[PDB]
């Protein structure tokens, strides 16, 4: 007997991942090839990532894109979970560049358009890959780019930031290797810029055998631009590789760029006074201001739970409505001598409630701010 799952005969190992391997497979009748990712249920229990695996399967299964690897079926067994995906025979984009060297400006653009098309598709669907690199970019027989590993991917939630540092140091954005907070579509653009550079120059923009030196190079955003590079695409690279997240190019900005617009297929992109300030500020010490809040929260007879020293979740019962309104308190650091308390509303899954969710959020904040001010 052989090893067979869903009529597919499991072949050689294509590669490995943090849990379970990826094996090629072949249909017994048709001979159709698929790539099967075997997830050990006891190993995903060890790491307590079960939520993620459940989450990644939900999202990826809905995904339909030419340049993103499709998930055909997920087969469950008592011991293991089998993810049946599409198989591309070109292997890694990385191995391709190693063997054939850099790509001419025409082919580099063709591939980069396909890759960014996929990165866009994910971001539209509120999914951030954030492992992006030539190792995770595959190729079919016709040299079409395919995004592959979503293991480190995450879901974008409204009003939420991602602290997790994912991916190889070379392809990681300066805010990632610095361990700061990010929204995450701007992290995928940085990586896409490195991939674009890799396609053009056949080398990495930021690389060093000395890790502290490498991290400085990335944060400085300084990289060598070869003389044979079109100054048009250099401007694009300079924009995507911006250290400052706010000055960094968006997908809209790249699509407007003249170097990117050239020979772009139609199918790739679907048709397309008073000074406010955030929260409340204090120059007092982090443990002092944190102490202040807690006293005031109690003064209003609110109940709170401490998730993190600087992160509080506060819930309040409106006397009239008899329901509850939840909000989150997070302390940030604006400057060395300045700190900021942030207010964020929490969506209730409850049945329709009397009053206004938005306003009751304001009133809840108003009481606390009145004390702190």
């Amino acid at each position: 007997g052989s090893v067979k799952i869903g009529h597919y005969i499991l072949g050689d190992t294509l590669g490995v991942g943090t849990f379970g391997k990826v094996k090629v497979g072949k249909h017994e009748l048709t001979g159709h090839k698929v790539a099967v990712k075997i997830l050990n249920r006891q190993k995903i229990r060890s790491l307590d990532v079960v939520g993620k695996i459940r989450r990644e399967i939900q999202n990826l299964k809905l995904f339909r894109h030419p340049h993103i690897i499709k998930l055909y079926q997920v087969i469950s067994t008592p011991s293991d979970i089998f993810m049946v995906m599409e198989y591309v025979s070109g292997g890694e984009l990385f191995d391709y560049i190693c063997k054939n060297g850099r790509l001419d400006e025409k082919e580099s653009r063709r591939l980069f358009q396909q890759i960014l098309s996929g990165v866009d598709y994910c971001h539209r669907h509120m999914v951030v890959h954030r492992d992006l690199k030539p190792e995770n970019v595959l190729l079919d027989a016709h040299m079409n780019a395919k995004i592959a590993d979503f293991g480190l991917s995450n879901m974008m939630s409204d009003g939420e930031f991602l602290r997790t540092s994912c991916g190889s140091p070379n392809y990681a954005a300066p805010e990632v290797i610095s361990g700061r907070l990010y929204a995450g579509p701007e992290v995928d653009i940085w990586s896409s810029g490195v991939i674009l550079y890799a396609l053009l120059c056949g080398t990495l923009p930021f690389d060093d055998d000395h890790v502290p030196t490498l991290f400085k190079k990335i944060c400085d955003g300084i990289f060598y631009t070869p003389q044979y590079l079109n100054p048009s695409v250099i401007s694009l690279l300079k924009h995507m590789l911006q250290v400052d997240p706010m000055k960094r190019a968006t997908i809209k900005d790249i699509r407007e760029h003249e170097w990117f617009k050239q020979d772009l297929p139609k199918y790739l992109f679907p048709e397309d006074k008073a000074k406010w300030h955030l929260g409340i500020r204090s120059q007092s010490r982090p443990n002092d201001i944190m102490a202040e809040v807690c006293r005031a929260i109690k003064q209003l007879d609110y109940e709170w739970k401490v998730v993190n020293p600087y992160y509080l979740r506060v819930r309040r019962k409106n006397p009239v409505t008899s329901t509850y309104s939840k909000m989150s308190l997070q302390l940030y650091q604006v400057d060395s001598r300045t700190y900021l308390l942030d207010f964020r509303s929490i969506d209730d899954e409850l049945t329709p409630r009397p009053g206004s969710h938005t306003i009751e959020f304001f009133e809840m904040c108003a009481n606390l701010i009145k004390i702190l001010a």
Partner: protein, 300 residues
């Protein structure tokens, strides 16, 4: 079911809600003068009123409220208006509404446009707030201007009923009798009184001959709060209209032999709430509002 009535029944209010918009909300305990200043600051003509006590939206604050307050408590340019200074939205709502017994008129985002236009007509209001029944959050403020402008784009593609071709005289749309008007020399205070009594959106400004040389709108009243000149009402309507004078095209007018579609295409173009129907000599024969046109299109 008119060709238009079908459309008004099919689409929802959500379809009219812009991608990203701003919504101003007042607490009833807020000082009334500050609320009117806030309307000028944010460039908003009306705001939902929130009672922090009962935790519900009680009503709306419009420019008409600013007109009612001014006309009622105005004494002279020599003495300040204390009530406007002393009162809160809640306090004046008591005085004005004591015998009125008015509720808040709102609509769900999932309700149709036929329901929205009906609600505007039944209650005779120019501001219909859209509230999500689940979150209880006010989403958007619906007006006549947006609804009619919505339809016009859709109307163009489809067959045109003979209704559009008929003139105004034979369609009998608008008010041709007892037009509320002011002279060029008419004091603002007098104009405010006419606003209160007749309850009309605008007053055509006319000469001795009766020809319309200008128009005084409820919207033009808010400029008193903008420049804080509201304390002098003795000035004429002509001197009060000199603030928009830098750009003033003229008074928009339409005739009786004018086709209905021509009029709608005119109002949507200039984005004004009414037209002044006049004879050839500019003498005012009547008014065609946006509420007038909609009421016609919502009926068969």
């Amino acid at each position: 079911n008119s060709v238009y009535t079908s459309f008004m029944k099919s689409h929802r209010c959500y379809d009219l809600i812009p991608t990203s918009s701003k919504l101003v909300v007042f607490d009833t305990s807020l000082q009334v003068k500050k609320a009117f200043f806030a309307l000028v600051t944010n460039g908003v003509r009306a705001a939902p009123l929130w009672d922090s006590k009962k935790q519900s939206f009680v009503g709306m604050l419009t420019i008409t409220d600013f007109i009612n307050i001014l006309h009622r408590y105005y004494k002279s340019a020599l003495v300040q208006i204390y009530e406007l200074e002393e009162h809160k939205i809640e306090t004046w709502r008591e005085v004005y509404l004591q015998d009125s017994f008015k509720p808040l008129v709102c609509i769900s985002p999932n309700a149709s446009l036929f329901d929205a236009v009906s609600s505007l007509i039944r209650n005779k209001i120019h501001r219909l707030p859209v509230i999500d029944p689940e979150s209880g959050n006010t989403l958007y403020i619906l007006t006549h201007k947006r609804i009619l402008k919505f339809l016009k784009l859709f109307i163009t593609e489809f067959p045109k009923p003979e209704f559009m071709s008929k003139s105004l005289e034979e369609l009998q749309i608008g008010t041709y009798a007892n037009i509320a008007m002011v002279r060029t020399t008419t004091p603002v205070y007098v104009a405010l009184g006419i606003f209160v009594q007749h309850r009309v959106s605008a007053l055509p400004v006319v000469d001795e001959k009766g020809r319309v040389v200008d128009i005084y709108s409820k919207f033009d009243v808010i400029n008193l709060a903008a420049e804080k000149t509201y304390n002098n009402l003795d000035v004429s309507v002509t001197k009060a209209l000199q603030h928009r004078s830098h750009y003033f095209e003229g008074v928009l007018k339409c005739y009786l032999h004018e086709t209905l579609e021509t009029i709608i295409n005119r109002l949507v173009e200039a984005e004004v709430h009414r037209l002044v129907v006049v004879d050839e000599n500019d003498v005012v024969k009547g008014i065609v509002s946006l509420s007038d046109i909609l009421q016609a299109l919502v009926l068969t």
